[PDB]
Nucleic acid binder design. Structure first.
Length: 136
DNA sequence: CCAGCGGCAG
DNA sequence: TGCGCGCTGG
């Protein structure tokens, strides 16, 4: 279980559900966290699981993502990612549609106990990881 | 009521 | 290469 930290990372609240944590990383991509977080709550209220998100009509998701931008791109990504999350045989989420380095590094630091094996590039994640190494 | 900025899949 | 908004700054 990740310890108490001076950091403001949405991953620290979402880590028990890998899917929600990964969805947050999709919301945060090329988007202001100020915008992305309140919209992520609206999304999670309507789609609280991959089970329902994979059955969603991406155009419904898109309408919700409108003020964040990349709404069609991210809506189609979310639906497809959610389907792969439950149906593909994955060990690391980098194998899944729409997930890259950011989501993968977040998963290995927060959902699994592999923070030592990770080289984060995201500014906050990198400082958080520096704090783990310092306080190990 | 300006306008630059910020990696995934195809 | 397309994707996109509003925040940010002044």
């Amino acid at each position: 279980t990740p310890p108490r930290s001076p950091f403001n990372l949405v991953q620290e609240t979402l880590f028990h559900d890998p899917w929600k944590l990964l969805i947050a990383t999709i919301f945060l991509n090329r988007t202001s966290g100020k915008m992305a977080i309140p919209v992520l709550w609206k999304f999670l209220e309507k789609y609280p699981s991959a089970e329902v998100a994979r059955t969603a009509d991406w155009r419904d998701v898109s309408e919700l993502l409108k003020p964040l931008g990349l709404y069609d791109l991210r809506a189609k990504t979310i639906v497809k990612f959610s389907d792969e999350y439950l149906t593909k045989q994955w060990k690391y989420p980098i194998e899944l549609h729409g997930i890259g380095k950011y989501g993968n590094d977040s998963y290995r630091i927060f959902c699994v106990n592999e923070w030592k094996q990770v080289h984060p590039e995201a500014h906050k994640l990198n400082k958080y990881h520096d704090w783990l190494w310092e306080n190990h």
